[PDB]
Amino acid sequence: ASFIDNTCRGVMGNRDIYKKVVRVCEDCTNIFRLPGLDGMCRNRCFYNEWFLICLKAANREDEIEKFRVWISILNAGQ
Protein backbone atom coordinates (compact mmCIF):
# COMPACT_ATOMS: atom_id res chain seq x y z
CA ALA A 1 0.00 0.00 0.00
CA SER A 2 1.03 3.63 -0.46
CA PHE A 3 3.41 4.38 2.41
CA ILE A 4 6.11 6.50 0.77
CA ASP A 5 6.05 9.91 -0.91
CA ASN A 6 7.12 11.38 -4.24
CA THR A 7 8.57 7.90 -4.72
CA CYS A 8 8.67 8.16 -8.51
CA ARG A 9 10.96 6.39 -10.97
CA GLY A 10 9.78 7.55 -14.40
CA VAL A 11 9.16 11.18 -13.44
CA MET A 12 12.46 11.58 -15.28
CA GLY A 13 11.17 10.24 -18.59
CA ASN A 14 7.54 11.30 -18.28
CA ARG A 15 8.18 15.04 -18.12
CA ASP A 16 4.50 15.26 -19.06
CA ILE A 17 2.43 13.44 -16.44
CA TYR A 18 4.27 15.43 -13.78
CA LYS A 19 3.88 18.95 -15.16
CA LYS A 20 0.24 18.04 -15.77
CA VAL A 21 -0.32 16.17 -12.51
CA VAL A 22 1.25 18.85 -10.31
CA ARG A 23 -0.78 21.30 -12.39
CA VAL A 24 -3.89 19.20 -11.78
CA CYS A 25 -3.38 19.51 -8.03
CA GLU A 26 -3.15 23.30 -8.28
CA ASP A 27 -6.54 23.51 -9.98
CA CYS A 28 -8.22 21.38 -7.32
CA THR A 29 -6.22 23.12 -4.59
CA ASN A 30 -8.16 26.18 -5.72
CA ILE A 31 -11.57 24.51 -5.62
CA PHE A 32 -11.15 23.90 -1.89
CA ARG A 33 -8.39 26.50 -1.56
CA LEU A 34 -6.73 24.16 0.93
CA PRO A 35 -2.94 24.21 1.30
CA GLY A 36 -2.97 20.63 2.57
CA LEU A 37 -4.22 19.15 -0.70
CA ASP A 38 -1.94 19.99 -3.62
CA GLY A 39 0.72 17.84 -1.97
CA MET A 40 -1.48 14.78 -1.52
CA CYS A 41 -2.59 15.10 -5.14
CA ARG A 42 1.03 14.92 -6.30
CA ASN A 43 2.49 13.44 -3.12
CA ARG A 44 3.33 9.73 -3.25
CA CYS A 45 4.39 9.98 -6.89
CA PHE A 46 0.72 10.83 -7.41
CA TYR A 47 -0.13 7.31 -6.27
CA ASN A 48 -2.91 7.61 -3.69
CA GLU A 49 -6.11 8.22 -5.64
CA TRP A 50 -5.49 11.79 -4.49
CA PHE A 51 -5.75 12.36 -8.24
CA LEU A 52 -9.47 11.59 -8.46
CA ILE A 53 -10.08 13.96 -5.55
CA CYS A 54 -8.57 16.89 -7.46
CA LEU A 55 -9.73 15.59 -10.84
CA LYS A 56 -13.22 15.65 -9.33
CA ALA A 57 -13.04 19.30 -8.27
CA ALA A 58 -12.74 19.81 -12.03
CA ASN A 59 -15.75 17.65 -12.88
CA ARG A 60 -13.28 15.93 -15.20
CA GLU A 61 -13.08 12.72 -13.18
CA ASP A 62 -12.61 11.05 -16.56
CA GLU A 63 -8.96 11.49 -17.51
CA ILE A 64 -8.20 9.45 -14.39
CA GLU A 65 -8.15 6.25 -16.45
CA LYS A 66 -5.27 7.49 -18.61
CA PHE A 67 -3.84 9.45 -15.69
CA ARG A 68 -3.83 6.20 -13.71
CA VAL A 69 -1.81 4.07 -16.12
CA TRP A 70 0.55 7.05 -16.23
CA ILE A 71 1.22 7.11 -12.49
CA SER A 72 2.10 3.45 -13.03
CA ILE A 73 4.62 4.32 -15.75
CA LEU A 74 6.59 6.54 -13.37
CA ASN A 75 6.85 3.37 -11.29
CA ALA A 76 8.74 1.74 -14.15
CA GLY A 77 12.08 1.32 -12.37
CA GLN A 78 10.23 1.52 -9.06
Burial of 54 (0-12, 13-18, 19+ CB in 10 A): buried
Helix axes 17-28, 64-73, angle to 10 degrees: 130
**CATH value at residue 47:** 1.10.2010.10
Structural domain including 4 reads 1-78
Q: Write a three-state SS string for the chain.
A: CCCCCCCCCCCCCCCCHHHHHHHHHHHHHHHHHCHHHHHHHCCCCCCCCHHHHHHHCCCCCCCHHHHHHHHHHCCCCC
Number of domains in the chain: 1
User: What residues contact 59, with CB distance under 8 A and at least 6 apart?
Assistant: none
**Experimental method reported for this structure:** NMR
